[PDB]
C-alpha cells in the first residue's frame, strides 16, 4: 500500500505519525516527524515560513494523510502560534524544509526577526507572563 515508496523521511520523533494528520494540527506533527528542523510537534512551533508549505508538499503531502491544503492549514494553525513568530517575518523561518531560511534570509537578519517577537512581546507585555515558557 502507499503511493510514495521509500517516502521521503521519518525521524525518531516521540510524537510519531500516530493520528492520521487530521488536516491541520497533527500534520504539524507529521511535518515535524518528517522535518525535525522545520517543525517541532514537540513544541508549540518554531519560526517557520509559510511558503515552505509548497516544499513541504514536495515531501509531505499525501504520503500519509495530506491533500496539501490540509497541510497548508497546518501551516496556518501552528503558524498563528506565537512561537512561530518568535522570528518569522523574514528568513526567520530558517527553513524551507531542508533548513534554509526559506532561503530568504541569513540569520543575522532574521535576527531582527528574532527580535520582532520582542516587538510583540513588548506589545503584549504588561503581565509577568508572556515569554515565560
Swiss-Prot record:
Give the record's GO biological process terms: post-transcriptional regulation of gene expression
Question: Could you tell me the superkingdom of the organism this chain comes from?
Answer: Bacteria
User: Coiled-coil intervals in this record?
Assistant: none
State any GO CC term: cytosol
GO terms, molecular function: RNA strand annealing activity; RNA strand-exchange activity
Function summary: RNA chaperone with significant RNA binding, RNA strand exchange and RNA duplexing activities. May regulate ProP activity through an RNA-based, post-transcriptional mechanism.
Name recorded for this polypeptide? RNA chaperone ProQ
Native species:
Escherichia coli O45:K1 (strain S88 / ExPEC)
